[PDB]
Design a protein around this ligand. Structure first.
Ligand SMILES: *[C@@H]1O[C@H](CO)[C@@H](O[C@@H]2O[C@H](CO)[C@@H](O)[C@H](O)[C@H]2NC(C)=O)[C@H](O)[C@H]1NC(C)=O
Ligand SMILES: *[C@@H]1O[C@H](CO)[C@@H](O[C@@H]2O[C@H](CO)[C@@H](O)[C@H](O)[C@H]2NC(C)=O)[C@H](O)[C@H]1NC(C)=O
Ligand SMILES: *[C@@H]1O[C@H](CO)[C@@H](O)[C@H](O)[C@H]1NC(C)=O
Lengths: 56, 49, 7
């Protein structure tokens, strides 16, 4: 979508031109490489919509 | 609006249709190409009026 | 995905 931001306690994705945070998920984010390569990377969960539903 | 410069270039890469991870996986190399090309301009301008 | 929810 846009940009990662934090309010100091939680991380969100938001669109670049109007602050509107959403939870970070497999659907608004995509993978490349691994955690060693990127400069200034940080740690958080990324939520999966699928597994908690397909468990039941 | 303040923004970190390695984020500004990732959006400018995205604007030319190149996926932004192509910057982060190569950031130091990209910066060395930029710094070298800046260097060549001093030489170029110093060579002839 | 709903029609796949047999499993
Ligand atoms: C950062 O944003 C999150 C989500 O809006 C805030 O977390 C909530 O905090 C209140 C108490 O202030 C709780 O009642 C909610 O249950 C929390 N929600 C979640 C999903 O955890 C958080 O407080 C914000 N932090 C700052 C410093 O603004
Ligand atoms: C992000 O999380 C990973 C673990 O999931 C942290 O990696 C460990 O960090 C310590 C201290 O630097 C090292 O001794 C370990 O060898 C690391 N383990 C692995 C598997 O790499 C990492 O430090 C966390 N980063 C941040 C900024 O919190
Ligand atoms: C930002 O600057 C601080 C020192 O002011 C440094 O500790 C930190 O590692 C820097 N982070 C990045 C992502 O450049």
């Amino acid at each position: 979508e846009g940009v990662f931001v934090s309010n100091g306690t939680h991380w969100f994705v938001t669109q670049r031109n109007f602050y509107e945070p959403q939870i970070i998920t497999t659907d608004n984010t995509f993978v490349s490489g691994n955690c060693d390569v990127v400069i200034g990377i940080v740690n958080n969960t990324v939520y999966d919509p699928l597994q908690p539903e397909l468990d039941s | 609006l303040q923004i970190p410069f390695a984020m500004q270039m990732a959006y400018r890469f995205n604007g030319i249709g190149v996926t932004q991870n192509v910057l982060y996986e190569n950031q130091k190399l990209i910066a060395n190409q930029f710094n070298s090309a800046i260097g060549k301009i001093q030489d170029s301008l110093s060579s002839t009026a």
